[PDB]
Amino acid sequence: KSVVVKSWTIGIINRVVQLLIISYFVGWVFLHEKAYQVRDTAIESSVVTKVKGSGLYANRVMDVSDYVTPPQGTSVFVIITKMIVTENQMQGFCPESEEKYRCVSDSQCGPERLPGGGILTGRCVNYSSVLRTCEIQGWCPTEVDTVETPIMMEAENFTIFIKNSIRFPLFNFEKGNLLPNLTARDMKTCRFHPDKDPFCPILRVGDVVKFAGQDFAKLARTGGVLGIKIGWVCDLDKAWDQCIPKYSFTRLDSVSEKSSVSPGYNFRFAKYYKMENGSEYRTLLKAFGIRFDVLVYGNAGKFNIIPTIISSVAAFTSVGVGTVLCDIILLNF
Amino acid sequence: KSVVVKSWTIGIINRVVQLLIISYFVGWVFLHEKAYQVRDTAIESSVVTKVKGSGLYANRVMDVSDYVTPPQGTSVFVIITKMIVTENQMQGFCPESEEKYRCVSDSQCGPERLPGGGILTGRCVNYSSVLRTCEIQGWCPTEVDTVETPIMMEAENFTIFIKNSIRFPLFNFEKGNLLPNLTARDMKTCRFHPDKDPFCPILRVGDVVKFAGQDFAKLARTGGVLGIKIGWVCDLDKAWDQCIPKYSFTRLDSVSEKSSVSPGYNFRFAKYYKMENGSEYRTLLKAFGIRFDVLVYGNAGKFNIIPTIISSVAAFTSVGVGTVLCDIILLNF
Amino acid sequence: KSVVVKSWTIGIINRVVQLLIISYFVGWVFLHEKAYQVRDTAIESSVVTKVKGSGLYANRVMDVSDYVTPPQGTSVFVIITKMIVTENQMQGFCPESEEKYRCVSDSQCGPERLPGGGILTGRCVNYSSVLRTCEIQGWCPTEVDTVETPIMMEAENFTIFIKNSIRFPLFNFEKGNLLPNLTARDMKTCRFHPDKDPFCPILRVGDVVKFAGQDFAKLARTGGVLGIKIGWVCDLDKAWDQCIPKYSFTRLDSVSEKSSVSPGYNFRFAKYYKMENGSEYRTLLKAFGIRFDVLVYGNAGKFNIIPTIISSVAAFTSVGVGTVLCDIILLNF
Ligand SMILES: Nc1ncnc2c1ncn2[C@@H]1O[C@H](COP(=O)(O)OP(=O)(O)OP(=O)(O)O)[C@@H](O)[C@H]1O
Ligand SMILES: Nc1ncnc2c1ncn2[C@@H]1O[C@H](COP(=O)(O)OP(=O)(O)OP(=O)(O)O)[C@@H](O)[C@H]1O
Ligand SMILES: Nc1ncnc2c1ncn2[C@@H]1O[C@H](COP(=O)(O)OP(=O)(O)OP(=O)(O)O)[C@@H](O)[C@H]1O
Ligand SMILES: OC[C@H]1O[C@H](O[C@H]2[C@H](O)[C@@H](O)[C@@H](O)O[C@@H]2CO)[C@H](O)[C@@H](O)[C@@H]1O
Ligand SMILES: OC[C@H]1O[C@H](O[C@H]2[C@H](O)[C@@H](O)[C@@H](O)O[C@@H]2CO)[C@H](O)[C@@H](O)[C@@H]1O
Ligand SMILES: OC[C@H]1O[C@H](O[C@H]2[C@H](O)[C@@H](O)[C@@H](O)O[C@@H]2CO)[C@H](O)[C@@H](O)[C@@H]1O
Ligand SMILES: *[C@@H]1O[C@H](CO)[C@@H](O)[C@H](O)[C@H]1NC(C)=O
Ligand SMILES: *[C@@H]1O[C@H](CO)[C@@H](O)[C@H](O)[C@H]1NC(C)=O
Ligand SMILES: *[C@@H]1O[C@H](CO)[C@@H](O)[C@H](O)[C@H]1NC(C)=O
Ligand SMILES: *[C@@H]1O[C@H](CO)[C@@H](O)[C@H](O)[C@H]1NC(C)=O
Ligand SMILES: *[C@@H]1O[C@H](CO)[C@@H](O)[C@H](O)[C@H]1NC(C)=O
Ligand SMILES: *[C@@H]1O[C@H](CO)[C@@H](O)[C@H](O)[C@H]1NC(C)=O
Ligand SMILES: *[C@@H]1O[C@H](CO)[C@@H](O)[C@H](O)[C@H]1NC(C)=O
Ligand SMILES: *[C@@H]1O[C@H](CO)[C@@H](O)[C@H](O)[C@H]1NC(C)=O
Ligand SMILES: *[C@@H]1O[C@H](CO)[C@@H](O)[C@H](O)[C@H]1NC(C)=O
Ligand code: NA
Ligand code: NA
Ligand code: NA
Ligand code: NA
Ligand code: NA
Ligand code: NA
């Protein structure tokens, strides 16, 4: 009745408020928010990785054992793209190479000097005819950062194999980026895309860098950290084929690009040798590279009667309490 | 009064609905759900590991420094159970070993060929009298996957020492798998079991594999990833001795068993050497192994008056609103 | 009216209950709990680390490549502070060094003996004139724990460079411990303090140890695990300069101090060599050290109208339902 629609000119809004209440609780809260669903947020995941590619550096070929570290194929690994190599260091005495350590007086060679190649003898010494610096005890000779060294251009073409297995324990549901019908031809020719082809396990390094919105040429020079986020948000009421990984790419060391003091990612490690003599020598390496972190996240939902009962009862109580209160507020005013 | 139990034939259900409301809110929601409790979900954990055992491989003994990687005793480590060893590689030119790279025409040796040992010379060469393949520049000779190599049978008997410390910061509560009264005799003789003996820090590899429902013989051959979940769900209202770790075991790379393309877990690393000459050579290793991930999770609860007041008041409002509404629905109908 | 304040002597409490209801819902729940705010708990973080310092050990200088492992500058690394070095091991036969393996009868050399240097020959042999022990096959000679070795005192002075970048994706908000206006002078001279100077990226190892409430002298000897928690809890309604990292320090392997059986943290790894001959030898290392785990956590909040509407409406319904019920309870009693 037109008297029902408007128990008054205000009262037509009684209906309206009810509509919002009905909509919100039975629409967004019950349905869009899938209140009827039981949720698993304790996702269980595993990631294994392999890198394939070859490159020329220092007039030598580099293969996965050369440029990947650490090697164990985890969800976090570095592809070395640039190196400063200091060959055949031995324990001894020598002058620091860098200008920062420049010396003219043995009094200048004390505690105040920045941390460098070793312990200070407190002596001063000639590095070159033009230059004199403080003397240190340690691995000799010291590293020489005085010219930029090139990157491994080829690295853009290396591939990352990601084998990701996830499980939602509550629903005994298991799936992975590698579908059971995946075949050797597929691995050989499939081309990864976050929308077009979510289940190609092979990712091209250069592609990962571009998705993260980075320029390989710059990134390889500075070194950096990229994140490969893999998201499994699955509605198990829907089809098993509807549950697919969602890939997101970003550069995790965002501070680096905005900073003058530290622009990238590098670290130092050494290769250790011994002479037949049994004297000890090593090759020092300063590795610049791209670190990849594979981060997996997920939640899964399935229909279950228990929540459906509790949520719907909650829905009726709420729509009811809402209507009862809107009437009351209206009655006095 | 019998008139109270049934204010009508329907009205006996008024009581019943009240019972469900009373039960649900003051039973499950208040008690079974421990509403009276304050909860810490920000569990703080630490894990350190050590592996002990010896094995024969390649007619040599292997000890923890040989088969465990990485070595730092973290919550994630690999026990190498199978290896393909390529001894004394040097930088140079040579023919790819695998059949996949088979050659008869130098035109066949170009970009299309799968990633392998190095960069292609574009040349073609003889690997053997029977076989001719493409030529590569890199570490030589290339690896030869043409016969299966055996596993380290003994690995089933290696032991894993897990020292796990957890803390619930809110309650200043600290406990670990290693109880304070644990003694050298105990470490020497205690036998781990998830129900029978939760605080033996020593886990037998073979046992871990069986709990994960895996066959060591197969797992060692393919390589794989097992998860050791340690759960600390503690009711601090209960006794400190009631708070014990709950161990769960599974194989994390579930995709592997269901897939033809990639059945396991392996990775490649190298050992680097130099001649007195100063020419560089390395030993290439393809390691198959079991990776163990120790994953710790927990939440802790203690009685606190503040929630007890708020929850119980919430309980009374809810039982009350429920009864008020059930009466109303009944009155009009 | 004084009749309003007290509709009765009890009824003055009707007002009071309303006050608590008003206060709680519109005070603590709406405001102190920032109900008006939209929250991001899916914090995104990255951490890169570098260690700088030199030390004397075994009458040799040790630099970052010597005492830091693993080297890749992650949020988890070890600074080796103590070592038991076993030089030039070769594959062969020899007697176990430790007293635990003491022998007089070849029958004593069987399965029951604890895991040690290798596989048992089942033979018995003389380690020294005074001592006879079981014979093993493996890397020889076996390690000798018979005298305590010193720590690297200097390690207290090493520095940790932490470059931490975080992002709250929801708000497109990015910040790091390294502010954009940070300069070379700053890195050179700034002194870290959790309250006084949260954005100095350089942390002094000894300082980290003291903040964790530990004695370096003891910690370096046993080895241990320290946690560096970095917390980003930011109110984006407030100023961008108000969002600062909060640093917390602790010792994660708490079980260790309370236990006789295992007091610290150590692990074993080896350096591998080859003779020109091509026979294989290695140097075995038992590393004691401090492991640092950088753990980043955060949540961020910003004002948003959508929650403000829903929360405030929720607030009015709750204050209203509360008052309605308190009146009712009063009317019958
Ligand atoms: N552990 C540390 N203690 C003190 N200063 C450090 C430390 N690690 C890095 N720094 C300084 O912070 C700045 C940026 O470091 P970053 O590694 O990003 O650049 P870098 O030039 O590769 O550093 P370096 O070559 O000195 O190792 C440099 O001035 C570096 O000396
Ligand atoms: N980074 C990668 N790029 C391209 N293909 C890869 C990569 N990593 C692995 N694959 C391929 O995926 C398949 C399964 O890899 P998996 O490592 O499980 O087996 P595998 O035979 O040990 O691999 P391989 O011996 O070639 O390193 C193989 O055909 C392998 O060549
Ligand atoms: N994987 C393991 N299997 C059996 N026992 C172990 C294992 N790891 C450690 N233990 C034992 O637990 C005790 C404490 O180990 P911890 O490493 O803390 O001290 P440790 O003396 O350095 O050990 P070790 O020197 O024997 O490697 C020791 O008795 C040690 O033998
Ligand atoms: O609130 C998180 C929850 O709902 C979200 O809802 C989105 C909706 O999907 C969009 O269409 C748009 O209307 O904005 C809404 C925010 O209120 C998201 O769907 C998702 O984050 C989550 O399920
Ligand atoms: O809902 C999660 C919460 O309660 C759970 O309740 C279980 C109960 O323990 C079982 O006896 C059975 O009745 O199923 C209930 C599910 O509603 C669990 O106890 C636990 O996951 C958690 O505390
Ligand atoms: O309840 C967690 C939530 O509120 C907390 O409130 C604290 C308050 O900050 C203190 O002043 C004191 O009154 O104890 C309250 C606990 O009810 C905290 O502020 C914080 O953990 C969080 O925001
Ligand atoms: C990547 O590989 C393709 C061949 O598939 C080649 O054409 C291209 O030049 C390579 N890019 C780089 C940077 O080496
Ligand atoms: C492989 O299985 C998936 C499972 O959903 C399916 O979507 C896909 O079409 C299948 N591929 C082929 C070639 O049948
Ligand atoms: C080993 O020989 C090198 C030069 O060939 C020399 O520097 C060193 O002193 C020798 N080692 C010993 C222990 O004499
Ligand atoms: C494991 O060790 C026991 C001795 O305690 C031995 O009897 C058994 O044969 C071993 N198993 C394997 C697979 O080596
Ligand atoms: C060691 O302490 C725990 C602490 O709860 C106790 O359960 C156990 O019985 C104790 N063991 C012995 C041998 O007293
Ligand atoms: C080192 O000797 C090996 C063979 O003994 C040879 O292949 C290599 O060319 C030599 N290195 C140099 C730099 O001459
Ligand atoms: C740490 O360095 C300072 C110099 O800045 C020195 O005075 C002090 O003795 C050093 N401490 C240790 C333990 O070496
Ligand atoms: C650097 O920027 C931060 C940003 O909040 C500010 O707090 C600080 O005062 C600035 N430092 C200088 C020297 O201006
Ligand atoms: C290498 O020489 C060492 C001693 O110099 C000897 O122990 C070993 O048997 C030799 N290797 C071979 C394969 O003969
Ligand atoms: Na530098
Ligand atoms: Na595909
Ligand atoms: Na292969
Ligand atoms: Na026990
Ligand atoms: Na020992
Ligand atoms: Na500062």
Short mmCIF file of N, CA and C in Angstrom, two decimals, chain A residues 41-112:
data_model
loop_
_atom_site.label_atom_id
_atom_site.label_comp_id
_atom_site.label_asym_id
_atom_site.label_seq_id
_atom_site.Cartn_x
_atom_site.Cartn_y
_atom_site.Cartn_z
N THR A 41 43.58 -19.61 6.61
CA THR A 41 44.59 -18.60 6.36
C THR A 41 45.98 -19.15 6.63
N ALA A 42 46.02 -20.35 7.20
CA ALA A 42 47.27 -21.01 7.52
C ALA A 42 47.73 -21.79 6.30
N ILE A 43 48.06 -21.05 5.25
CA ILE A 43 48.49 -21.66 4.00
C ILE A 43 49.82 -22.35 4.20
N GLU A 44 50.01 -23.46 3.51
CA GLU A 44 51.26 -24.18 3.62
C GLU A 44 51.91 -24.20 2.25
N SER A 45 53.17 -23.77 2.18
CA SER A 45 53.82 -23.59 0.90
C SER A 45 55.24 -24.11 0.88
N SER A 46 55.70 -24.45 -0.32
CA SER A 46 57.08 -24.83 -0.53
C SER A 46 57.57 -24.24 -1.85
N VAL A 47 58.84 -23.85 -1.90
CA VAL A 47 59.38 -23.30 -3.13
C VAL A 47 60.76 -23.88 -3.35
N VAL A 48 61.01 -24.30 -4.58
CA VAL A 48 62.31 -24.76 -5.01
C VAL A 48 62.62 -24.02 -6.28
N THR A 49 63.89 -23.67 -6.48
CA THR A 49 64.26 -22.91 -7.66
C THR A 49 65.50 -23.47 -8.33
N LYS A 50 65.61 -23.20 -9.63
CA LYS A 50 66.78 -23.55 -10.39
C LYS A 50 67.02 -22.42 -11.36
N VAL A 51 68.28 -22.09 -11.62
CA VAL A 51 68.59 -21.04 -12.60
C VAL A 51 69.41 -21.67 -13.70
N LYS A 52 69.13 -21.26 -14.93
CA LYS A 52 69.83 -21.78 -16.10
C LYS A 52 70.28 -20.61 -16.96
N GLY A 53 71.54 -20.64 -17.39
CA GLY A 53 72.03 -19.66 -18.34
C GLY A 53 73.54 -19.64 -18.34
N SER A 54 74.15 -19.12 -19.39
CA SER A 54 75.60 -18.94 -19.40
C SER A 54 75.96 -17.52 -19.81
N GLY A 55 77.11 -17.05 -19.34
CA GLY A 55 77.55 -15.71 -19.64
C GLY A 55 79.05 -15.57 -19.72
N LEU A 56 79.51 -14.51 -20.37
CA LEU A 56 80.92 -14.19 -20.39
C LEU A 56 81.21 -13.09 -19.38
N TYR A 57 82.18 -13.35 -18.52
CA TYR A 57 82.68 -12.32 -17.62
C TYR A 57 84.18 -12.51 -17.40
N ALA A 58 84.94 -11.43 -17.47
CA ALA A 58 86.37 -11.50 -17.21
C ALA A 58 87.02 -12.45 -18.22
N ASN A 59 86.46 -12.48 -19.42
CA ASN A 59 86.95 -13.36 -20.48
C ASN A 59 86.89 -14.82 -20.05
N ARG A 60 85.86 -15.15 -19.28
CA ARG A 60 85.58 -16.54 -18.93
C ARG A 60 84.07 -16.78 -18.95
N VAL A 61 83.68 -18.02 -19.20
CA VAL A 61 82.26 -18.38 -19.16
C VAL A 61 81.83 -18.57 -17.72
N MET A 62 80.62 -18.14 -17.40
CA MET A 62 80.07 -18.32 -16.07
C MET A 62 78.79 -19.10 -16.18
N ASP A 63 78.66 -20.11 -15.33
CA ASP A 63 77.48 -20.96 -15.32
C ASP A 63 76.87 -20.94 -13.92
N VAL A 64 75.74 -21.62 -13.75
CA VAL A 64 74.92 -21.44 -12.56
C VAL A 64 75.73 -21.55 -11.27
N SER A 65 76.72 -22.44 -11.28
CA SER A 65 77.58 -22.62 -10.11
C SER A 65 78.51 -21.43 -9.89
N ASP A 66 78.65 -20.60 -10.91
CA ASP A 66 79.50 -19.41 -10.83
C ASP A 66 78.75 -18.17 -10.34
N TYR A 67 77.54 -17.97 -10.83
CA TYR A 67 76.87 -16.69 -10.63
C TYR A 67 75.66 -16.78 -9.70
N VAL A 68 75.23 -17.99 -9.38
CA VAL A 68 74.15 -18.14 -8.42
C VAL A 68 74.70 -18.42 -7.04
N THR A 69 74.24 -17.66 -6.05
CA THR A 69 74.55 -17.97 -4.66
C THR A 69 73.45 -17.46 -3.74
N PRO A 70 73.13 -18.22 -2.70
CA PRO A 70 73.66 -19.56 -2.45
C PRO A 70 73.06 -20.56 -3.43
N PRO A 71 73.64 -21.76 -3.52
CA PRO A 71 73.31 -22.68 -4.61
C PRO A 71 72.11 -23.59 -4.37
N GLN A 72 71.59 -23.66 -3.15
CA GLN A 72 70.66 -24.74 -2.78
C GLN A 72 69.26 -24.63 -3.36
N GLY A 73 69.06 -23.74 -4.32
CA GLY A 73 67.76 -23.60 -4.95
C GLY A 73 66.61 -23.34 -4.00
N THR A 74 66.73 -22.29 -3.20
CA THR A 74 65.69 -21.89 -2.25
C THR A 74 64.85 -20.78 -2.85
N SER A 75 63.98 -20.20 -2.04
CA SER A 75 63.12 -19.13 -2.52
C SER A 75 63.87 -17.81 -2.48
N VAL A 76 65.12 -17.85 -2.02
CA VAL A 76 65.97 -16.66 -2.04
C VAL A 76 67.38 -16.97 -2.55
N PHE A 77 67.75 -16.33 -3.66
CA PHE A 77 69.03 -16.58 -4.31
C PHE A 77 69.50 -15.32 -5.01
N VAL A 78 70.80 -15.26 -5.28
CA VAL A 78 71.36 -14.11 -5.95
C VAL A 78 71.92 -14.54 -7.30
N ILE A 79 71.67 -13.72 -8.32
CA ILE A 79 72.34 -13.89 -9.58
C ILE A 79 73.40 -12.80 -9.70
N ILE A 80 74.66 -13.18 -9.59
CA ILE A 80 75.74 -12.19 -9.64
C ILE A 80 75.82 -11.62 -11.05
N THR A 81 75.80 -10.30 -11.14
CA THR A 81 75.78 -9.65 -12.45
C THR A 81 76.99 -8.76 -12.65
N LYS A 82 77.77 -8.59 -11.59
CA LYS A 82 78.92 -7.71 -11.64
C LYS A 82 79.89 -8.11 -10.54
N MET A 83 81.18 -8.02 -10.84
CA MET A 83 82.19 -8.44 -9.88
C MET A 83 83.41 -7.55 -9.89
N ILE A 84 83.97 -7.36 -8.70
CA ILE A 84 85.30 -6.79 -8.58
C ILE A 84 86.18 -7.89 -8.03
N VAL A 85 87.08 -8.40 -8.86
CA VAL A 85 87.88 -9.55 -8.47
C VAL A 85 89.28 -9.09 -8.06
N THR A 86 89.71 -9.57 -6.90
CA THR A 86 91.05 -9.33 -6.40
C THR A 86 91.74 -10.67 -6.31
N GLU A 87 92.62 -10.96 -7.26
CA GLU A 87 93.19 -12.29 -7.36
C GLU A 87 94.39 -12.52 -6.45
N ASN A 88 94.48 -13.74 -5.93
CA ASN A 88 95.66 -14.20 -5.21
C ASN A 88 96.10 -13.33 -4.03
N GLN A 89 95.18 -13.04 -3.12
CA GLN A 89 95.54 -12.38 -1.86
C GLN A 89 96.29 -13.31 -0.90
N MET A 90 97.29 -12.76 -0.22
CA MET A 90 97.98 -13.49 0.83
C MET A 90 98.07 -12.64 2.08
N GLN A 91 98.17 -13.30 3.23
CA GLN A 91 98.31 -12.60 4.50
C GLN A 91 99.65 -11.87 4.53
N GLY A 92 99.65 -10.59 4.89
CA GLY A 92 100.87 -9.80 4.89
C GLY A 92 100.71 -8.33 5.23
N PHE A 93 101.61 -7.50 4.71
CA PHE A 93 101.53 -6.05 4.91
C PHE A 93 101.48 -5.31 3.58
N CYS A 94 100.66 -4.27 3.52
CA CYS A 94 100.53 -3.48 2.31
C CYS A 94 99.77 -2.19 2.55
N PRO A 95 99.85 -1.26 1.60
CA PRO A 95 99.18 0.04 1.67
C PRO A 95 97.75 -0.02 1.16
N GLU A 96 96.82 0.63 1.84
CA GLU A 96 95.44 0.65 1.37
C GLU A 96 95.36 1.34 0.00
N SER A 97 94.56 0.80 -0.91
CA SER A 97 94.45 1.34 -2.27
C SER A 97 93.60 2.60 -2.41
N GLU A 98 92.50 2.65 -1.67
CA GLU A 98 91.51 3.71 -1.86
C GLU A 98 92.03 5.08 -1.42
N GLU A 99 91.55 6.12 -2.09
CA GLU A 99 91.98 7.49 -1.80
C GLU A 99 91.60 7.89 -0.37
N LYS A 100 90.51 7.32 0.14
CA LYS A 100 89.97 7.67 1.45
C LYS A 100 91.02 7.54 2.55
N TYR A 101 91.93 6.59 2.35
CA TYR A 101 92.99 6.28 3.31
C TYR A 101 94.30 7.04 3.08
N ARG A 102 94.25 8.10 2.28
CA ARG A 102 95.46 8.82 1.88
C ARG A 102 96.29 9.33 3.07
N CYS A 103 97.60 9.14 2.96
CA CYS A 103 98.54 9.37 4.05
C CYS A 103 99.64 10.36 3.68
N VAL A 104 100.07 11.18 4.63
CA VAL A 104 101.36 11.85 4.51
C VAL A 104 102.14 11.76 5.83
N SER A 105 101.40 11.59 6.92
CA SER A 105 101.96 11.50 8.27
C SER A 105 101.50 10.26 9.04
N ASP A 106 102.45 9.54 9.64
CA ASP A 106 102.15 8.32 10.38
C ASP A 106 101.16 8.57 11.53
N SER A 107 100.99 9.84 11.89
CA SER A 107 100.04 10.23 12.93
C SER A 107 98.62 10.17 12.38
N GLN A 108 98.52 10.28 11.07
CA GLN A 108 97.25 10.21 10.34
C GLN A 108 96.74 8.77 10.26
N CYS A 109 97.63 7.82 10.49
CA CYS A 109 97.25 6.41 10.46
C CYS A 109 96.95 5.80 11.83
N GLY A 110 95.76 6.10 12.33
CA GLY A 110 95.34 5.67 13.65
C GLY A 110 93.87 5.26 13.62
N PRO A 111 93.19 5.41 14.76
CA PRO A 111 91.83 4.88 14.95
C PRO A 111 90.77 5.55 14.07
N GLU A 112 90.94 6.85 13.85
CA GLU A 112 89.91 7.66 13.21
C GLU A 112 89.58 7.21 11.79
#
